[PDB]
């Protein structure tokens, strides 16, 4: 009943599969077949959603791509457990 | 919201583990909680992922838990390899 909910879920899935290389605004917008402005707004909402305390993945931006990464507050736990790293 | 950060820890852990996932014991061990506790938390995160706005699901296969994409979004993931 939220018109961009499936759009938002697709963006999450894409970034999830994209992995540590991530995806650019353009790449994301082309897959969804929406404008870049529309895509940005969706990405932003997802980024907001991830900022919630109960969420352990966040949507970061660097090197011209969006990508999913863990929150720094959780590192002590993740260290008890390859993987790919961003510091 | 007393288990929010715990659920966040589980999400973070499963996300980093990849497609090989983690058993209940590993999760319970990292969180330093009982297996029964870990299970309650894993199940709640599973319920959260089943909402339509989430693009990932949590599943149990071969006695491990893992995150994966929902297969209803497959046609967009094809459109990514291309």
């Amino acid at each position: 009943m939220g018109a961009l909910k499936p759009a938002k879920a697709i963006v999450e899935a894409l970034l999830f599969a994209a992995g540590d290389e991530g995806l650019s605004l353009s790449q994301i917008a082309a897959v969804l077949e929406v404008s870049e402005l529309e895509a940005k707004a969706v990405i932003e909402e997802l980024q907001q959603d991830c900022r919630r305390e109960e969420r352990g993945i966040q949507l970061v931006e660097l090197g011209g791509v969006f990508l999913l990464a863990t929150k720094k507050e959780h590192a002590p736990y993740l260290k008890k457990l390859a993987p790919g790293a961003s510091p | 919201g007393a288990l929010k950060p715990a659920k966040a820890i589980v999400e973070a852990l499963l996300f980093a583990a990849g497609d090989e996932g983690l058993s209940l014991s590993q999760i319970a061990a990292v969180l330093e909680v009982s297996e029964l506790e870990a299970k309650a938390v894993i199940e709640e995160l599973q319920q959260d992922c089943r909402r339509e706005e989430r693009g990932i699901q949590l599943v149990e296969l071969g006695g491990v838990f893992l995150l994966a994409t929902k297969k209803e979004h497959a046609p967009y993931l094809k459109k990514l390899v291309e």
């Binding site: 994209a18 540590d20 966040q58 590192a75 | -």
Partner: peptide
């Protein structure tokens, strides 16, 4: 050194 973990790309597969 603030650690953020990423995960590798998924099953590129056929799709």
């Amino acid at each position: 050194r603030a650690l953020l973990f990423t995960k590798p790309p998924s099953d590129l597969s056929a799709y």
